[PDB]
Symmetry: none
Subunit: 68 residues, 6 copies
């Protein structure tokens, strides 16, 4: 369930990327959903305002949404 | 009513975008009006003071305002 | 006790010494080395240093947050 | 790398060296010392050694689980 | 929200103990409720079958319950 | 229907206990019958093979069985 930020970036950059959705919570927690029906949580307050990360996710067609 | 940031960006980039207007709220919620009379909410605090997004929208012919 | 300035140096350094970094919400970083050592760095600004976290990840160093 | 037998010894030992123990669900213990060192112990049975965890806590040593 | 097992034992042994309820999940996670309306989670697979801990909690009048 | 383990122990220890019978299920759920015709469920896996609990109950005059 818990995923390091490094492992998260690994999953995103994966050429056969299994990441389907990333939920960006306002308390600095990312909820990451995979195509095969897994869900992870990443403690990363810095990703919350990380424009290039977000646009990288979007450019990959990964569903990105905020949560509060 | 609820719209992902990804889908929002896609709808903006659309060759024949149906996005007519975007309101950027201080609380980080974007209100997106479409041509068919629909209105969506996009939770995206990262977009509030995004100059690049604003300029993109303006250049696409989409009305943008901040309140 | 380890200064932030020494930390950035240890990260940028050529020879792989840093193996894991934990960014705690209280502003303290825990820095793990490959020779079985661990340091603490007082740096509440380290959560905003996107360049540093970016290079950390780029070098395959495990980065995680805790609260 | 640290043997479990050396670990129990380090804990039972008179002089406060062990400061924190993390019991991971994969059977690995992370042992932190007060002189800024960290060891790993392969011991899947360590989660069942109630005597050890009891004395660990009794000495004010921080004990936590992770998964 | 996250609480170390040591801090948990500290809270239990406290003479002015603020612990009102301990929920023992079958996946080795403890959910600890306080009298002042706080809730914590303790990762401790070993407490799950810890008879003396449980009877210590019960003897203190702390509400102990299992969850699955 | 749902009963805490603490309350269960209290009801058993009661000077004039209303507990008439306890069934100890393999799945860790205790079914507790009272004299007034009530029946409660107690989630307590730790009580399954508890010899001390069984002997306590038997000595209190409470019918115990395991299925």
């Amino acid at each position: 369930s818990k995923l390091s930020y490094t492992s998260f970036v690994q999953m995103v950059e994966d050429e056969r990327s299994v990441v389907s959705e990333v939920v960006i919570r306002d308390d600095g927690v990312l909820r990451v959903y995979t195509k095969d029906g897994r869900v992870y949580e990443v403690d990363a307050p810095w990703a919350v305002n990380d424009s290039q990360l977000i646009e990288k996710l979007v450019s990959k067609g990964i569903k990105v949404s905020g949560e509060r």
